[PDB]
């Protein structure tokens, strides 16, 4: 098995920023060589063969050079839809071998989230059970606390919290907090509340509603 | 134009088996060579190995000869993947890809179209559909000209659901979060929408949710 090797890892860089990784081969591979983008949630995607060859419909922004055992892709300009990981896989031969990619990543500037809170559904309340769910929607950076409160006291109990990958749009994450009560022990309170704290925010920002109302 | 779909995914039991399939369309299936790739969750790309247009040569990775049989029926333009005994090593998202770009009298190809995978568990728990519940647009998700709408599908296993809106025809600021595993071992998870705030009342908006390990298929309409 040849083994590849990919440096950097992962990287961080701005939009508008060159790009540069590199690919090792444990030996010489000629110009069998290929390159793969891997969006956050996504199948891999081809986007260069035989070293330096474009795949159809792949941006001119993307390059790849190199011959034997050292190969470099390159980004000229980079693009918030760039977000991914890239592989390396040599074609020269059996078994055919990825190498362990390289995660890129997108610094922006300090985006605050907007806040939006929701009640348990009547539907759901029917089932003997109340998920509350407050969303922290595209923020940066990915840092953020969100405290649970309710009639004015704070809630140490069932919440769960869950981050997106960046967006291939504006390079943001959301996050959303889910608060799981029995519909007995979400009747015994009448304000829920969750209270957001981002750098984007010059205080911390409190999102409530009345049960029932 | 190409297009490659897996299905076959869900739960296995450690030493069981499953045969996984990739229906195809686009393109002659007879004249390319069909290959399959693994990811395990948050790790790389792993070859598995490749099928020829008249499986007359068909190669693996040394390492997996034992737990994969690859297959093919040109007829019905589908690639097959037997799963043989697999041990908890080999818990992967399976895609099946399309060489192409192939060598003059040289065993070369670039992997040129990939199915969207399919994630094989490997456990000894059961299988359990999801619960769908709405996250209603309010003025308490509301933020000017922008409202925010979801959904909840909630207690599955194993994963993976998707999460599609108004049948595909709605993907602008769609968020579907990473599952989460409650307390009762089942899966959780939230798909949001920032749509315009006027749209609330005159616009339709549906989630469409399935979890193909149990063949649940839910649509449910959001409603503010």
């Known amino acids: 098995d040849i083994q590849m090797t990919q440096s950097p890892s992962s990287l961080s860089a701005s939009v508008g920023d060159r790009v540069t990784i590199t690919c090792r081969a444990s030996?010489?591979?000629?110009?069998?060589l290929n390159w793969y983008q891997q969006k956050p949630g996504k199948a891999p995607k081809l986007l260069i063969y035989?070293?330096?060859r474009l795949h159809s419909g792949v941006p001119s922004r993307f390059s790849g050079s190199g011959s034997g055992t050292d190969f470099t892709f390159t980004i000229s300009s980079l693009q918030p839809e760039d977000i991914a990981t890239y592989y390396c896989?040599?074609?020269?031969?059996?078994?055919?071998?990825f190498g362990q990619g390289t995660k890129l990543e997108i610094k922006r500037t300090v985006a605050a989230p907007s806040v939006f809170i929701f009640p348990p559904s009547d539907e759901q309340l029917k089932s003997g059970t109340a998920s509350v769910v407050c969303l922290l929607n595209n923020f940066y950076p990915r840092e953020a606390k969100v405290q649970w409160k309710v009639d004015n006291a704070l809630q140490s109990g069932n919440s769960q919290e869950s981050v997106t990958e960046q967006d291939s749009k504006d390079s943001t994450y959301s996050l959303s907090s889910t608060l799981t009560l029995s519909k007995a022990d979400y009747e015994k309170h009448k304000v829920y509340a969750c209270e957001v704290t981002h750098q984007g925010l010059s205080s911390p920002v409190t999102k409530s509603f009345n049960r029932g109302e | 134009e190409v297009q490659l779909v897996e299905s076959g995914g869900g739960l296995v039991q450690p030493g069981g088996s499953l045969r996984l399939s990739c229906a195809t369309s686009?393109?002659?299936?007879?004249?390319?060579?069909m290959s399959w790739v693994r990811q395990a969750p948050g790790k790389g790309l792993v070859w598995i190995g490749e099928?020829?247009?008249?499986?007359?040569?068909?190669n693996y990775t040394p390492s997996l000869k034992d737990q994969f049989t690859i297959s093919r029926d040109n007829a019905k333009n589908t690639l097959y993947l037997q799963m043989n005994s697999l041990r908890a090593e080999d818990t992967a998202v399976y895609y099946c890809?399309?060489?192409?770009?192939?060598?003059?009298?040289?065993?070369?190809?670039?992997?040129?179209?990939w199915g969207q995978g399919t994630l094989v568990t490997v456990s000894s728990a059961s299988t359990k559909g999801p619960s769908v519940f709405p996250l209603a647009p309010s003025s308490k998700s509301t933020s000017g000209g922008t409202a925010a709408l979801g959904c909840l599908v909630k207690d599955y296993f194993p994963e993976p659901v998707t999460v599609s809106w108004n049948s595909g025809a709605l993907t602008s600021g769609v968020h579907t979060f990473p599952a989460v595993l409650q307390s009762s071992g089942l899966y959780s998870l939230s798909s949001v929408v920032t749509v315009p705030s006027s749209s609330l009342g005159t616009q339709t908006y549906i989630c469409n949710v399935n979890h193909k390990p149990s063949n649940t298929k839910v649509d449910k309409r959001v409603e503010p």
């Open positions: 890809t399309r060489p192409n770009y192939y060598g003059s009298r040289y065993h070369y190809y670039a992997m040129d179209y």
């Open positions: 686009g393109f002659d299936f007879s004249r390319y060579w």
């Open positions: 099928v020829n247009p008249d499986s007359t040569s068909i």
């Open positions: 030996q010489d591979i000629n110009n069998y």
């Open positions: 035989y070293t330096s």
């Open positions: 896989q040599q074609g020269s031969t059996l078994p055919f071998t």
